[PDB]
Amino acid sequence: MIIYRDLISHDELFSDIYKIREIADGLCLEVEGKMVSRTGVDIVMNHHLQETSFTKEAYKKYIKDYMKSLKGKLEEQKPERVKPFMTGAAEQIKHILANFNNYQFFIGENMNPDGMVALLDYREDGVTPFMIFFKDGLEME
């Protein structure tokens, strides 16, 4: 069994039980799940994901403070990743803020303000949820 954890806040985010697809040229992970009623998202309820909200400036302030934190973790763990990290993120941050009204925010269990903020949206069918994480801010245990 594979468990993907946040590299910063050490919070449980998701596992390999869902469909994992790669997007943004290897920058973000596309975790495909389904709606289960025990009604909620299976990926959210199974990993203690705490929901939060951000404004256009607070998220831009956070994502600038968080993407810098991941770049520092790459400089100590995978220095060759720093170059493709800033390139795809600059295009991705401009893609997230452009579609800011379509994403929902979630944080780790500890609710650390420095942790990862996950995004949630729906496919063209409107009922299949998929979550967007940062691939470089995860540790595979």
Residue numbers in the entry: 1 to 38, 68 to 170
Quoted passage from the original study:
Histamine-Releasing Factor (HRF), also referred to as Translationally Controlled Tumour Protein (TCTP), p21, p23 and fortilin, is ubiquitously expressed in eukaryotes, and involved in apoptosis, cell cycle progression, cell proliferation and cancer (Bommer and Thiele, 2004, Nagano-Ito and Ichikawa, 2012, Bommer, 2012). In addition to its diverse range of intracellular roles, HRF is also able to activate mast cells and basophils, with the release of histamine, implicating a role in allergic disease.
We report here the first crystal structure of murine HRF (mHRF), solved at 4.0 Å resolution, revealing the conserved HRF fold. The structure of mHRF was solved at 4.0 Å resolution, and contains two molecules in the asymmetric unit. Residues 1–38 and 68–170, and 1–41 and 67–170 were modeled for chains A and B, respectively; similar to other crystal structures of HRF, the mobile loop region (residues Thr39-Val66) was disordered. mHRF contains a C-terminal His-tag, which was also disordered; a substantial region of continuous electron density was observed close to the C-terminus, but the tag could not be modeled with certainty.Fig. 1 mHRF. The overall fold of mHRF is conserved, and comprises three α-helices packed against two β-sheets, while a third β-sheet forms the base of the mobile loop. Like hHRF, mHRF contains two cysteine residues at positions 28 and 172, and thus has the potential to form a covalently-linked dimer; while Cys28 is buried, Cys172 is surface exposed. However, the two molecules of the mHRF asymmetric unit, which are related by non-crystallographic two-fold symmetry, form only non-covalent interactions. The two molecules bury a surface area of 176 Å2 at their interface, in which Glu80-Thr84 from one chain pack against equivalent residues from the other, with a hydrogen bond between Ser82 from each chain.
